[PDB]
Amino acid sequence: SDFNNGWKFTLSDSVCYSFVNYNPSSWKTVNLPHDWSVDLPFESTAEGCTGFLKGGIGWYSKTFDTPDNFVDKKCYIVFDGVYNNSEYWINGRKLGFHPYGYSPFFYDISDYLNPKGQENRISVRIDHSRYADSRWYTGSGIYRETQLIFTDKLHIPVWGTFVTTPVVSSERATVNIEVRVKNDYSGPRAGEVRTSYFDSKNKKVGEKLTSFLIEAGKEMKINQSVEISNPSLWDVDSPSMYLAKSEILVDGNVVDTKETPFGIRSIKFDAKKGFFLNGKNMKIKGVCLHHDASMIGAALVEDVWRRRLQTLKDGGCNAIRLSHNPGADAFLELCDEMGFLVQEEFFDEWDYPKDKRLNMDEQSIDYITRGYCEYFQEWAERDLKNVMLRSRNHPCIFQWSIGNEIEWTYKGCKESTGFFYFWNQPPYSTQRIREEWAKQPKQTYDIGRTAKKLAAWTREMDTTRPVTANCILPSISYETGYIDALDVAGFSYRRVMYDYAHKNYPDKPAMGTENLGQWHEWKAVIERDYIPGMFIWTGVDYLGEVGTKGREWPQRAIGCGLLDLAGFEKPSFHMMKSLWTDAPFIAIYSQTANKSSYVEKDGKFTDKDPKKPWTQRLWVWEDVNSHWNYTKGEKVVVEIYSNCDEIELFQNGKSLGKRFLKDFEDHIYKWSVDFKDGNIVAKGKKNGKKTTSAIYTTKETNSIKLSVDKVAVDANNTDVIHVTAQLIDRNGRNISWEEKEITFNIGGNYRLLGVENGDHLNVLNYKSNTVKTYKGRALLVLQATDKAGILNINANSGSISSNDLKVEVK
Ligand SMILES: OC[C@H]1CNC[C@@H](O)[C@H]1O
C-alpha cells in the first residue's frame, strides 16, 4: 500500500478532468515517479536545448479513501518535485499552483477529506507546453516520489526537525535538534518532546525530554542538546548514519513521531590551507550532475543512480554538484549512504532570463522558452526555503549554491571586466573594474542586491554550511558585492584566476565549482593548498543543450560526461581515475597517427596544433580507440592514462622501451607503434607496487556476452536489473571496433525501462527491445514488478547468439 502506485495519467487536457463527477478510469495506470517525455519519440521538430523531446499539457489523478480513524487528525500531501507549472485539485476544489519544476512543497488537505471510509480524489494538471523553458532536458510530470501523511492535530509538521552538530571531536559530539511542534487543536495543549538517538547498529546512544505548553494555532520551537560519546563520524570513506527519533507525548503516550536520519561530521573552508572534513585536509574530487538518466528521464529511480555513483566513486570522485537546481530527497539519501559531499544549487537564473538555446543573456523572445523567471520575484523565497527545510538534515550537503553563471544576465558585468577570457586575467585593474561598474547604467534589478537577499534567506535556514555560487566572471563579482555575500567563491572555468583570488582577496576561500574534465585543471588544484578542489562538467552525460551550430539533430547530448548516457566508463573517466585514485592503474587507448592529437619527432612527443595545446583542452574527449584492430602496418599512436611513475610497453613480447610519467607534461604516456595483429601489454609500477593491463586483436564478431549486475531482486515495483551486452570473438575477446543490432528477449513478469548504447551523436527508441551497439556494447534496463518469478534473458543479432541469463524476483 504505497501511495506512489496506481496513479492514472493522460497526455490530454480538458476542463472537466478536475470535476467531482469525472471518472478517469479510461486513463493509463502509472507508478510514481513518472516522466512522460521519455515515452514520446525523439523528434526533429522539438527543441535541442531540451533533448529533442516534447512536453505538452498532461494530467494525473489519484484516489484514496479517508482512514476509518480520521478524527482529531491532519492530512498533508507532499511532492518532492513536479515539472512544471503544475496545478492541484482535491474533490473538485483548487488547492493551488506551483511554478518551479525542482522545489518540493505540500498541501494541507485535512478539511477536504470526505467522511471515514469514503473516496477522495487528487488531480494534477501539468503545463509543460513551454517545452524549451530550460538549457538542458527536464522531462514532464511527477518525476519524484510523493507522500500522504496523516498526523495528530498536535504534531511535528512536515520537515519539522533540524539536526546540527556544532562541536565535534572523536571523544564526543554535541548534537542539537530543533523540533517544531504545531498545535492545531482549538485549545491549549501540554506535552513533552522525547528525542532518542540511535547508531549504525540501532543501539540507543542518547535521549532528551523537554516539556511544553503551546496555545491553540501556535507553533513552538523546542531545542534539545545531548553529548554523543565516541561518535561514528560520517566521512566519504565511512558514511556512518545516525537516527533521531523525536516523539510528541501527551500524558505518557506517543501521539506523533518523526525520524530524522543524520550524520555527525565537521566541515571547514580555510582560505589559506583548503578544505577540512573531520579534520582531514582533502581535495574535493567533484563532478556536476544533471537530473536525468536517459531511458528513465527525470524519473528518480534509485538503483539506476546507485550504479552510476558506484562507478563514479570507483573512479575516485568524492563530491557532487547538483547542477543547476535542487536535487531529489532520494538522491541526497543515496549520497548520505554511499558517501559524497553535495553542493545543492537553488537556481540557474535570478531576475533576468538566460537564453535557453544559446547560453548567456536572452537574445530572442518566444512562448516556448518562457521560464521560471516569470515567477522568481514572487516565488524565490518560498522555494529556496522549502528546498532547505527538506534538504538541511542530510549529512552529504556541504555547500548551498545560490546561483550558476549569473553574471551573463545583468547588463554591465561582462562589460566591466576588460574582456569584451578562459585563459587570461582581466586587462583592467580591480579599481578600474570598480570604476567601469559605477559607469554602467542602473537596471531595475542588481546582481549584488539580489545576491544579498538570497544569501540572507539562506542563512535564516542554515548557518552550518557555507554559501557559495558558481561565478563565471569573478573579477567583476568581487566588486559588485556578489562574492562578498558568499563564504566560498566558486569559479566557473577560472583556473587562471586562482592566483588572482589569492593575491587580491586572500581571506576569501576560493574553489573550482565548474571545470573541464582535463589534467590541466587538476594540476592547478594540487599545486595550490588555497584551492581545495573542482567539479567536472560533467560526471555523466545528459540530454539537451544541443541543436546549436555544430550539434544539430540527431545529436542528443554533448558528450562532456565521464560516463556516457548508459553509465559506461568512457575515456575521460579513465583519465580522471588515473588522477583521483591511488591503487596502481593503467588504461590503454590509441588513434591512427593521422587522427591523434600528438606526434613524435626525434623520439619526443608534442602537440600537433600549438594553437590547441594540452593546457587548453575543453569538455569533450577525443574519440579514441580501446581496440587493437587496425589494418596491417598502419602507423599508430598509443596513448596511456596512468598513475604509474614508470611503464614499459610490450608489442607481442618485444619491448618497446620503458618511459616515465615525469617526461610527459600532459600526464599522458605515449608510444609510436607499427600495427600488426597480436596484443599490446603495459607493465608499470607506482612506487614499487606493480600492475598490468593489455588490449588484444580480435577476430570478427562471434557471440553476445550478457552480464547482469544482480542475479536476484525483490518484487517491490522498484528494484532494477541492468543487463550489459558485449560482443565477443570465437575466443571470448571483447570487440569495440564494429557494431551489431542486438535484440533482447525476456521471459517472465517484468517492466521495461529501456535501452541505451551511450552514443551521444544519435537517437534511438528507448522502449524497444532492440538497440544498436556503440563501441561493441549496449545496456538493457528492466524493473521488478508486483509479480515474483524467474526472468530468462537472452539475445541475438540474427546469426549471432548469446549466453543465457536467469534472474530471480523474490
Ligand atoms: O556545456 C557548457 C556548460 C557551461 N556552464 C554551465 C553549464 O550549464 C553548461 O552550459
Residue numbers in the entry: 32 to 451, 459 to 848
From the paper:
replaced with W657 and C598 in GH2C, respectively. to specifically accommodate the β-linked AHG residue. generate AOS products, which are substrates for GH2C. AOS by GH117B and GH2C, respectively.
